[PDB]
Design a protein around this ligand. Structure first.
Ligand SMILES: O=C(O)c1cc(O)c(O)c(O)c1
Ligand SMILES: O=C(O)c1cc(O)c(O)c(O)c1
Ligand SMILES: [Fe+2]
Ligand SMILES: [Fe+2]
Ligand SMILES: [Fe+2]
Ligand SMILES: [Fe+2]
Lengths: 416, 416
């Protein structure tokens, strides 16, 4: 509930490569590390509990289904395979509770989101994180990732990114735990990595953009994609993500540090901001925002025999849902019927999860966090219908349950 | 550009099964068909070119990545496997042009979207379609699917669904072809299919809701999820999608038909609305709206050697981007390096597409519509770096290209 500041950093794989090839000592590469060091030192000294982390995936985990604002709500995130194998990094921990509260505020502010778990983070996240935070056994803080769909047009306007940041500030502020939160925006600065224009940089624009983002970010809010691509290269226009982070900070900030280095394709830059707090009181008190965020499901606990699939439940039931979900794969559901024990022995399921499936504990699974639709599919796999599951939920024989219906009929989701 | 009207219909897999099992002869099932018949007949008579089709995926194609408003932008859609094989239905065609236009308008109105291609349509979609539209040989119209994330809370508010429908109206009207568009809302009415409350129905509310949706929909815009689930059962609350459809229609509509039937778990209902056009001209002209929708990328054409990855290019490049994307899978990439021709032979790629990859035609791939990040993965897989691809983009040797950089370094996205 206290924002301590935030940082902006390039995410080019140059950075990841430098860490992985130990170019630390090499003077050609060294300005990257000198650039990142104060940010690294600040994070080690301030110890945020959670860093809300703004980046874009580069058509690695996000491709056939591609969303604008994708909130990472899961327990952990491993590195993604980008065609040369996963980087040797430990998973970083998420924060489902914080993520949930943020989702709730942002949805009440009429932003449309995506939620995701269990997919890798590509270079867009782990390239700079790997230089900013020591990563033995785990990582110094939690992150709540926000993956932004900045590469498939149309994308949200610069001002939408800004306005997201503003709502994010209040959401974070109003989270009812006394914890420290830093905000990161990655990407940029100028670069183009495609077409005959590949190799474009604009240091003059980079300096001005840095200056304006720090001290007059509202001046940037009428910039178009075209404006940003013309001045800083096609992919350099990813800096709208810097506007999101900056919008989540105080109207004025202390620039603790900034760095600029252009060795190759990309202007590698960092910026470190100390939040200055709110000069003005907020239009809406934390108390009132918290009540407005929960008003959609206020009173929902009064509904008996109902297990709302909220984010916490989605996270709790993730492994088992994910396993049951694979029953739509013909080779997987074949192994499930024929050699279930072989499939369990290979899974990441707890004994309790295996046992619920093995016992066909219909209500037990709903209770646990399984969404009915996973049970619907399992039913189909076993050649039994929906009515069988419903009767099990009611603790009744199929015949007794069928008496509650206006007609006695049967059906399933089975195809051909 | 002309909206002819819209229809609301239940999407329970009772309907899909009723059709696949030929239950039209059984009087217990008969009235499912009796209810759908007028909507069937209206469709055959009116012949819309495209149905803009609002449904929810029941955690089949959307699970680990789950978005609020996911717009189907691809060429065609096949039925999904839901554990019992795909239903025996021919693919239905998309409308990438209409979908791109709608994206542009909705984003300008500050709705945050997801874009998807190539994933199957579950019972949310094909269940009622299979009874609404003959499919002996393909389908009578195209669709643009809007998959709504109504199952994992927090979801967007009732008023947000409605407002989406309000912009969608203008989005469709402003589309510059004289096609006829129908709009479909699916789901409902009262049902609950999980927990000890499974089997809840409330006919008295279903009737009020039908009444109010037809003739006073704005009186529904204050309903919370709690209101909807309490009155209509947990899953019954998906009727927010009916609201979205209704928002896209004229403020007043003529109800041509409604039906209601409660055999088993779900209240199976249909509503058919005739659009009445616009009483007064819109707040914003079609032309001003298109201006607003296009301004972010206006004058992007003046940026040389640059190929914005817009939706049309995402559709054009889908097959090949998909194929290259699979380079992230260890087994796939090993086949790619070791027997590319075997891999090509198995794939759905065209000869041109195969050539582009075979010849390592970097810039030719960009021109074709391959996004660079697929090429980045491909270079990594092949043991070469980003520099190599950038040099080819420019038509320079690597040493000649390195001279344009401040330092001559090499790097890639390779892991362990
Ligand atoms: O070649 C580069 O410097 C580069 C490559 C990337 O994939 C990227 O996202 C980036 O920001 C920079
Ligand atoms: O059992 C039912 O009537 C039912 C099952 C579903 O999976 C569903 O999406 C629905 O709207 C109704
Ligand atoms: Fe490391
Ligand atoms: Fe990026
Ligand atoms: Fe059929
Ligand atoms: Fe449903």
């Amino acid at each position: 509930a206290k924002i301590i500041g935030g940082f902006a950093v390039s995410h080019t794989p140059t950075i990841a490569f430098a860490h992985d090839a130990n170019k630390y000592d090499d003077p050609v590469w060294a300005p990257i590390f000198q650039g990142f060091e104060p940010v690294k030192q600040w994070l080690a000294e301030q110890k945020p509990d959670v860093t809300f982390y703004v980046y874009n995936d580069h058509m690695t985990s996000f491709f056939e289904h591609y969303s604008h604002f994708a909130l990472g709500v899961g327990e952990e995130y491993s590195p993604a395979d980008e065609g040369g194998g996963q980087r040797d990094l430990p998973p970083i921990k998420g924060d489902p509770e914080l993520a949930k509260h943020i989702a709730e505020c942002l949805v009440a502010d009429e932003f449309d989101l995506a939620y995701w778990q269990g997919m890798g983070l590509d270079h867009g996240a782990f390239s700079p994180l790997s230089v900013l935070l020591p990563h033995e056994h785990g990582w110094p803080c939690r992150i709540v990732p926000l993956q932004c769909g900045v590469l498939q047009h149309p994308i949200p306007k610069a001002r939408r990114f800004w306005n997201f940041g503003r709502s994010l500030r209040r959401a974070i502020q109003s989270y009812p735990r006394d914890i420290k939160v830093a905000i990161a925006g990655t990407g940029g600065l100028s670069h183009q990595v495609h077409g005959e224009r590949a190799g474009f940089n604009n240091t003059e624009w980079d300096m001005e953009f840095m200056e304006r983002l720090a001290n007059d970010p509202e001046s940037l809010l009428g910039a178009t994609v075209t404006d940003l691509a013309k001045k800083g290269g096609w992919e350099g226009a990813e800096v709208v993500m810097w506007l999101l982070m900056r919008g989540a900070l105080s109207p004025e900030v202390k620039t603790l540090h900034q760095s600029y280095f252009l060795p190759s394709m990309t202007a590698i830059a960092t910026m470190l901001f100390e939040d200055q707090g709110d000069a003005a009181p907020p239009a809406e008190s934390d108390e009132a925002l918290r009540a407005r965020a929960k008003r959609e499901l206020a009173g929902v606990e009064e509904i008996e025999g109902t297990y709302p699939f909220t984010i916490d439940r989605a996270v709790k039931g993730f492994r088992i849902n994910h396993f049951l979900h694979r029953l739509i794969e013909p080779d997987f559901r074949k192994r499930f019927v024929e050699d279930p024990e072989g499939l369990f022995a290979e899974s990441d399921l707890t004994e309790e999860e295996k046992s619920l499936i093995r016992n066909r504990d219909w209500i037990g699974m709903i209770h646990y966090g399984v969404i009915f639709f996973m049970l619907e599919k399992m039913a189909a796999v076993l050649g039994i219908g929906n009515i069988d599951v419903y009767a099990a939920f009611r603790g009744l024989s199929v015949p007794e349950f069928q008496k509650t219906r206006n007609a006695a009929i049967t059906y399933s989701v089975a195809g051909k």
